[PDB]
Ligand binder design. Structure first.
Ligand SMILES: Cc1cc2nc3c(=O)[nH]c(=O)nc-3n(C[C@H](O)[C@H](O)[C@H](O)COP(=O)(O)OP(=O)(O)OC[C@H]3O[C@@H](n4cnc5c(N)ncnc54)[C@H](O)[C@@H]3O)c2cc1C
Ligand SMILES: Cc1cc2nc3c(=O)[nH]c(=O)nc-3n(C[C@H](O)[C@H](O)[C@H](O)COP(=O)(O)OP(=O)(O)OC[C@H]3O[C@@H](n4cnc5c(N)ncnc54)[C@H](O)[C@@H]3O)c2cc1C
Ligand SMILES: CC(C)=CCC/C(C)=C/CC/C(C)=C/CC/C(C)=C/CC/C(C)=C/CC/C(C)=C/CC/C(C)=C/CC1=C(C)C(=O)c2ccccc2C1=O
Ligand code: HEM
Ligand code: HEM
Ligand code: HEM
Ligand code: HEM
Ligand SMILES: CCCCCCCCCCCCO[C@@H]1O[C@H](CO)[C@@H](O[C@H]2O[C@H](CO)[C@@H](O)[C@H](O)[C@H]2O)[C@H](O)[C@H]1O
Ligand SMILES: CCCCCCCCCCCCO[C@@H]1O[C@H](CO)[C@@H](O[C@H]2O[C@H](CO)[C@@H](O)[C@H](O)[C@H]2O)[C@H](O)[C@H]1O
Ligand SMILES: O=C(O)/C=C/C(=O)O
Ligand code: SF4
Ligand code: F3S
Ligand code: FES
Lengths: 240, 622, 212, 212, 79, 79
């Protein structure tokens, strides 16, 4: 709504060494109900096309929009210029290998960290036939299953975790909750002891110092706080 | 340079691409999946509605069978589809839904009891099967008879692709994210791979493989308003188009979805019209029984979308700086309900719009959604003019859909279709093996494709890539809409042809760098324009109205002289697509008939009564 | 035998990390209960130096500073070992946690830094105070003098904030992270604990002046 | 601006590392020099009680302990902070070093682990000794013979070997690690130095029993 | 190199010449290799890499393990 | 199967092999050096004698030329 948004965009390009980091100022007129997706895409597609942002759906369920917005890792497309102050500062997500400008590589981390935690349903292989009928599932278990499998793998809860930013081998609220989503699933046949072998030694579960930045930065609102919690108990009670 | 090998190269990492890579890998072949962004974020993840496969478990689906599914499928497709393709698919959907459910999707299941549903803008009570408690639940969607659409709360795409991906990691599919395919590696009408572009370094790569697949999805970003994610330029289409060997099928068929959100253009799901949707006018009047009396907003899609632009030409839309629009009323549906408590279209209206659905009305307008045509395939999914090229998905013309796609059938097509096309890809790869001549990968390919990069970078040829893009957008929005006439079409095709000339001379506003993000779009402007005129010239020279293609000068369906598929090749070096035509399934199981909604005026088929039922050799046994 | 690497202890795997984390939390609760015992007994000079002296000669011959004094010395340092695992001693763990901690503008994140700075101060002065009063000389209200006036113990204006801040963020933390969490009960817990901390620092500073 | 990844703190890279290690070496060197002076000046009980009383009055009545007490207090804690960087707290750092050091039979490797046990014993016992004698009461040999033998301080046997063991390995290591030793001169340094230490245990243990 | 018959060594190898031959021959043969490669380029028919190659040679491995013709390889090495 | 590509494939990574990989890579060609063990430890590393090459520097070689090298090489080696 007509007020003048000024943006300071992080600028760096690892592929030519001559490019040092800096703060570049941009100037955009704000119209009604404008997402920072609109602001940036016009900054790029209009003034400087070599700005690199990662945009996918502009509907907010994918996770390529992740960045730091005026200090908080957040979502660019799913964040609207109403809530932000008059000057904005967009920074690339931390912890993640910066590819350039605002863009970082996340999914690489998610796949390594995925194998680390082995996030899939482990089939005891009773010789199931899609010819025959399907699994027995109550609606509410499968609904919290949806609540956790609903993560959009944006990268905000890691880039906000002091532990991770401090210790890179720490595998993140993301990874804790993912193992959670296979713990409470019956279709994944895994002993609780297997689960400890995955997240029970340190660097996942007991590496958490409890900053609660996950819970407070998560854009889609996973129940990280109490899922992380119930996981640190379930694993910690491995003791006799 | 940087040549990689595999057996199965899946160009695209989304849902079909993932299923096929998982089958090549389930039978144990080595596989590379190229993806523009991590496979998790694709456009399959933005899918809010659900997955259509005949089950029989919910009360509102009691008795549903793939007979009904096939039947409904064909009817929705305006008999524009291959009925062999759709038979196989209708029977393969359940196999695939039990399977993927077994892969851990959180399908919403049935709850025994009696519930209060919504059919029209009025609720009716209905029970739920007492003995099918935990089985897989469905919902009303599209032009279905029974409720077959299977869902996980809202994001079903997120939740089906998500376990499909965990199966990818488990079976070890090597994935190079950030790889933009550019040309295909071929010669002798034999396909050896593709040349690609590193979305990190900026130099070309050239994956070499026996069996290659095109998963790249829809081309909708050639339009101003589309529900498509900004990553959808149709890459595999533009790489199969520049070969001039394999064509594009039924290209003109562009389905518009009615409930596209007005201010952002984001899609709000059809489970909304599917559970007690209410489409209202500027005065808030439910106008669907006026146009389509019985099936109302559960009508075929191109139907509701057509009716809406009609009703809006009358003067009855709501006027916005965003343009005039209608309303979708889900406040009807209940608050603690909202498709299991959360609904994730609730967040669409919450964050992006000023509307709360349990109070106000969602500004909604017909806007661009699925893209029917694509790389033509066969019953086994091998692409047309070139050997060893395969395709599945939105980017593909399997034509299990025809001229209108029935809602919720595209997910089942990705897993149903990825499974089948994959199976045939698997045994073709476990068959004969090529000879990779490097005067194909090297001669042209790396050369021609590196050459277009150089011409777009260093040269005069100055035209700004964003002006040809946005001028294209205006050309498509005005020229080819929902309602089409002969003369605006040809006017469009003429300026689109000259824009293709202009799109060959391209310049960049920028200063070259390792990986310039501008060049990614600039080099594909030519391609965007090309398959856009495939859709336009496909629609101009098709004089009849079928499916979402509705011609104001030729409104009848005209089964006599077009019951068919518009195949567009390119061949050099030209300014215009060559248009050839091909029979829509001679297989006809359900002969041409009335859909049971819409204003259908048909010039009844004359020739077909010869053949009709001759299902002679069915290798549809599976 | 297994003396190089490949995996853990015994024939397969070692649970030591959880046991010891569980033991960092059990030290956190036990130390919190003590520091309640201390801020009950010794804050009784506001009420009367007779109540503090009486309940002070009460427990197991004056809280058994033979058998209970070593309890809290060995237990407080054992806590020290369990926590030093995570303390940002490395120059980059500090530098980063300070850069991230100033940019996030997020609260509980920044309180971790106070758990740390407080941690070193209450290590030294906590040990040296606990020691000077941990010795012989059975307890009186008069003895202080071991504080105050002519006394040269001026540090409970420093020890009191660092200590009761630490115990507060620690009480809050041990609640989340182990499943006593919210987010429902998260806020009631949040201002319950915030209230609890500022309340103990007040009646401590008033035990401090009302000891004078 | 740089609140991200990139590389370190200035427009190229950080120099914090060398400065930081170097100042661990100078906190070890300056602190070694103090302990020399301490066990020279106040190790005078056996020479004469009058001599230590005087040499204490030599600089501002017990060697200026209001400007020298906070010197070795805050500087000794800053040593603790700089060295705690490498201390094997993480249960795996312990687990590994214990197996590597027990399998190698290598001496100085095994001396690092005692450098550790010693360091924790002297933070606690040392902070409370340094503190109890740092609080006013200018020194008298007769009052120190007070505590020792009563206070009750005593011990220091549970301190003297741990302490000088530590200072010894610390001198040995600081010599090697920055290059002040062999091969050529190496053994002379180790045998010489082990003699420095065993001698410090002697003149300390008898400064100890003779103070009684 | 030594594996090669270039024949700068003939029927008696000159002392100190075998080091000289590996580096010198690498320089010369190498230059020539950069020529033959930088020029025309081949076609890898997989009925060669796949057929035979993998086929005949994995056949030697399977015949050596799971098969008969039982004789000890060491006795044959030492004999 | 599990196919790798390069321009220059050196079967053996030792001393001849390494030089040839170094000039192919010096001209910037994709090159794979296969070795039965890490390239440092080969038989080229066990060479204790030295490498025979014309100098002009040593006082025991003053006047030395490749003529004599060529000659002695041919002649000690028979043909
Ligand atoms: C908002 C929205 C909602 C939808 N809701 C539903 C629904 O409810 N029910 C339903 O049935 N269908 C729905 N659809 C349709 C759905 O998108 C498709 O039918 C299908 O899910 C897409 O899957 P796909 O694998 O063919 O391709 P996509 O999922 O579209 O992705 C294509 C893959 O190929 C990759 N790729 C892209 N470009 C290139 C390139 N140049 N080179 C190489 N690789 C590339 C991409 O990275 C991607 O991974 C919806 C679509 C949208 C946009
Ligand atoms: C003790 C000894 C001392 C010598 N001293 C001298 C000297 O002093 N002066 C002098 O001029 N010459 C000397 N020589 C001769 C010298 O060994 C050769 O002439 C030359 O140095 C060998 O170098 P090379 O790189 O060509 O081959 P090698 O050193 O033999 O290396 C062989 C390479 O091929 C790899 N390889 C091996 N097997 C396979 C396989 N099955 N498949 C694929 N790759 C494989 C190997 O792992 C290795 O990398 C000496 C030789 C020996 C044995
Ligand atoms: C002021 C009230 C008053 C009489 C205080 C002196 C009595 C004291 C200090 C008891 C110490 C003490 C306290 C404060 C506890 O909270 C606790 C919790 C669980 C087990 C034991 C104890 C305990 O012994
Ligand atoms: C030398 C002494 C001490 C040091 C060095 C120290 C430091 C720390 C640190 C750094 C933590 C954070 C652990 C983490 O973030 O994971 C911690 C945890 C904690 N501290 Fe202490 N502290 C000491 C003594 C005390 C004291 C006096 C109290 C007073 C009640 C206390 C109570 C707690 C509690 C409850 C926790 C939470 C336990 C957990 O996270 O499992 N500690 N301490
Ligand atoms: C068995 C163990 C302990 C006993 C019996 C004890 C007893 C006392 C006594 C008698 C006092 C009052 C005057 C003085 O400080 O000389 C006191 C004050 C204080 N002590 Fe201790 N102490 C013990 C250990 C501790 C511990 C573990 C801490 C942890 C930080 C601590 C911190 C303090 C503080 C901060 C004060 C003054 C603050 C206030 O009164 O609010 N003491 N304690
Ligand atoms: C809390 C108190 C103390 C702690 C935690 C401590 C611990 C340590 C540690 C862990 C190191 C190892 C550095 C490394 O391994 O690279 C070290 C080195 C050393 N320490 Fe201490 N010590 C303490 C008190 C003392 C005292 C009283 C002295 C007496 C002179 C001393 C003298 C030295 C010396 C000379 C070094 C060698 C410095 C170097 O390696 O660069 N330390 N100390
Ligand atoms: C301002 C600093 C210091 C002063 C004024 C000081 C002075 C004293 C005094 C007065 C005594 C009493 C002698 C007795 O107990 O009869 C003593 C004993 C002792 N103090 Fe210190 N000291 C200081 C620093 C240190 C340090 C850094 C340590 C490290 C462990 C230490 C450990 C000892 C030991 C081990 C003894 C008795 C053993 C012996 O004398 O050999 N002191 N010191
Ligand atoms: C309870 C445990 C207590 C933790 C241990 C004690 C504190 C941590 C010890 C190491 C501190 C490292 O010191 C930290 O980085 C360097 C030292 O190299 C200092 O010097 C500089 O560092 C960087 C510059 O690139 C800046 O963040 C900082 O503003 C600046 O001062 C910082 O001021 C300090 O934040
Ligand atoms: C640097 C500061 C001082 C160093 C402090 C570092 C903290 C780490 C100290 C404890 C580490 C002990 O390291 C190792 O732990 C494991 C598991 O507990 C012990 O394991 C032993 O006790 C456990 C617990 O009953 C048994 O299950 C096991 O059978 C037995 O072997 C080893 O006996 C011990 O050697
Ligand atoms: O709006 C939806 O729910 C989806 C419609 C479709 O694409 O079928
Ligand atoms: S937790 Fe929230 S932020 Fe972290 S990935 Fe899952 S969704 Fe994105
Ligand atoms: S922010 Fe960090 S410490 Fe665990 S509490 Fe969340 S991951
Ligand atoms: S852009 Fe798709 S989620 Fe932000």
């Amino acid at each position: 709504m007509n007020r003048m948004l000024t943006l300071n965009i992080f600028r760096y390009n690892p592929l030519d060494p001559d490019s040092q980091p800096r703060m570049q100022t941009f100037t955009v007129q704000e119209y009604d109900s404008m997402t920072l997706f609109i602001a940036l895409t016009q900054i790029r597609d209009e003034k400087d096309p070599t700005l690199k942002v990662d945009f996918c759906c502009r509907a907010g369920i994918c996770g390529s929009c992740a960045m730091v917005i005026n200090g908080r890792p957040g979502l660019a497309c799913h964040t609207q210029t109403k809530d932000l102050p008059a000057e904005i500062t967009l920074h690339p997500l931390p912890f993640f290998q910066l590819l350039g400008d605002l863009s970082v590589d996340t999914g690489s981390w998610f796949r390594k960290t995925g194998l680390q935690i082995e996030a899939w349903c482990h089939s005891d292989d009773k010789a199931f036939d899609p010819t025959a009928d399907e699994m027995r599932m109550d609606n509410d278990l499968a609904n919290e299953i949806f609540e956790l499998d609903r993560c959009i793998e944006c990268g905000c809860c890691v880039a906000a975790c002091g532990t991770a930013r401090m210790r890179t081998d720490f595998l993140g609220a993301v990874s804790i909750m993912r193992v959670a989503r296979f713990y409470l699933d019956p279709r994944d046949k895994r002993s609780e002891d297997d689960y400890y072998d995955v997240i029970g030694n340190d660097q996942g579960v007991f590496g958490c110092m409890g900053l609660l930045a996950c819970e407070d930065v998560c854009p889609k609102g996973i129940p990280l706080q109490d899922q992380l919690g119930i996981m640190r108990r379930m694993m910690a009670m491995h003791s006799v | 340079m940087q040549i990689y090998h595999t057996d199965v190269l899946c160009i695209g990492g989304a849902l079909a691409g993932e299923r096929v890579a998982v089958e090549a890998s389930m039978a144990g072949l080595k596989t590379i999946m190229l993806s523009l962004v991590p496979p998790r974020r694709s456009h399959s993840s933005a899918a809010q509605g659900g997955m259509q496969a005949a089950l029989g478990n919910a009360i509102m689906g009691d008795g549903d069978s793939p007979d009904v599914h096939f039947a409904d499928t064909v009817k929705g497709s305006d008999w524009g589809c291959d009925q062999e393709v759709a038979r196989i698919f209708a029977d393969t959907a359940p196999i695939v839904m039990r399977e993927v459910a077994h892969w851990g999707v959180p399908w919403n299941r049935v709850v025994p009891g009696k519930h209060t549903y919504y059919k029209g803008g009025k609720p009716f009570e209905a029970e739920e099967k007492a003995e099918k408690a935990g089985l897989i639940h469905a919902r009303a969607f599209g032009g279905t008879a029974a409720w077959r659409t299977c869902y996980t709360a809202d994001g079903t795409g997120r939740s089906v692709l998500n376990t499909l991906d965990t199966k990818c990691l488990q079976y070890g599919v090597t994935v190079h994210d950030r790889m933009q395919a550019e040309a295909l590696i071929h010669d002798g009408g034999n396909c050896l791979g593709c040349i690609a572009r590193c979305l990190r370094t900026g130099e070309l790569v050239a994956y070499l493989a026996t069996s290659t697949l095109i998963a790249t999805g829809g081309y909708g970003r050639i339009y101003k308003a589309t529900t498509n994610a900004v990553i959808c330029d149709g890459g595999g289409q533009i790489i199969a188009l520049d070969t001039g060997l394999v064509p594009m099928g039924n290209m003109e068929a562009v389905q518009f979805h009615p409930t596209g959100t007005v201010p952002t253009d984001i899609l709000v799901t059809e489970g909304c019209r599917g559970d007690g949707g209410t489409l209202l006018d500027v005065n808030q009047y439910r106008f669907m029984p006026d146009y389509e009396p019985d099936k109302a907003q559960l009508a075929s899609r191109d139907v509701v979308s057509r009716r809406m632009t009609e009703h809006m030409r009358k003067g009855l839309g709501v006027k916005s700086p965003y343009g005039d629009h209608l309303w979708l009323d889900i406040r009807h549906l209940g608050e603690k309900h909202i498709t299991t408590k959360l609904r994730e279209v609730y967040d669409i209206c919450t964050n992006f719009l000023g509307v709360n659905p349990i109070h106000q009305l969602i500004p909604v307008r017909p806007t661009h959604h699925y893209s029917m045509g694509g790389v033509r395939t066969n019953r086994d999914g091998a692409a047309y003019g070139l050997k060893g090229l395969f395709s599945a998905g939105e980017s593909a013309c399997w034509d299990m859909h025809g001229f209108n796609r029935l809602g919720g059938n595209s997910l089942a097509e990705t897993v149903v279709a990825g499974r089948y096309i994959g199976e045939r890809m698997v045994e073709f790869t476990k068959g004969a093996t090529p000879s990779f001549g490097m005067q194909y990968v090297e001669d042209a390919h790396k050369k021609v494709q590196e050459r277009i990069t150089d011409i777009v970078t260093g040269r005069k040829g100055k035209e700004n890539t964003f002006k040809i893009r946005d001028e294209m957008h205006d050309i498509m929005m005005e020229g080819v809409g929902i309602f089409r006439n002969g003369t605006d079409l040809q006017k469009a095709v003429n300026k689109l042809e000259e824009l293709y000339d202009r799109s060959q001379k391209i310049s960049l506003s920028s200063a070259c760098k390792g990986m310039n993000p501008e060049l990614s779009t600039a080099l594909r402007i030519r391609g965007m324009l090309k398959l856009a005129q495939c859709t336009a010239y496909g629609a101009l020279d098709r004089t009849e109205s079928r499916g979402a293609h509705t011609r104001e000068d030729f409104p009848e369906r005209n089964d006599k002289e077009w019951l068919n598929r518009t195949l567009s090749y390119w061949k050099e070096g030209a300014s215009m697509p060559t248009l050839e035509y091909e029979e829509a399934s001679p297989y006809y199981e359900m002969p041409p008939g009335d859909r049971g909604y819409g204003g259908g005026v048909t010039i009844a088929n004359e020739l077909p009564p010869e053949k009709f039922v001759i299902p002679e050799a069915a290798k549809e046994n599976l | 035998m297994n003396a190089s690497t490949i995996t853990l202890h015994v024939p397969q795997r070692s649970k030591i990390a959880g046991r010891m984390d569980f033991f960092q939390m059990v030290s956190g609760a036990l130390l919190i209960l003590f520091l309640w015992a201390h801020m009950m007994l010794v804050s009784s000079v506001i009420l009367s130096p007779s109540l503090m002296n009486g309940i002070a000669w009460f427990f197991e011959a004056t809280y058994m500073a033979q058998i209970g004094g070593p309890a809290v010395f060995v237990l407080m340092v054992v806590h020290f070992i369990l926590a030093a695992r995570k303390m940002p001693f490395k120059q980059d763990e500090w530098k980063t946690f300070r850069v991230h901690a100033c940019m996030l503008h997020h609260k509980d994140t920044t309180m971790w830094v106070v758990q740390v700075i407080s941690a070193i101060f209450i290590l030294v002065l906590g040990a040296v105070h606990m020691f000077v009063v941990l010795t012989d000389l059975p307890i009186t209200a008069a003895k202080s003098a071991a504080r105050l006036q002519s006394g040269w113990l001026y540090l409970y204006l420093v020890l009191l904030p660092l200590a009761e801040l630490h115990v507060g963020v620690g009480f809050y933390r041990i609640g989340v992270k182990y499943g006593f969490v919210g987010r429902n009960k998260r806020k009631w817990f949040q201002k319950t604990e915030n209230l609890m901390m500022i309340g103990f620092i007040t009646i401590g500073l008033l035990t401090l002046v009302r000891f004078m």
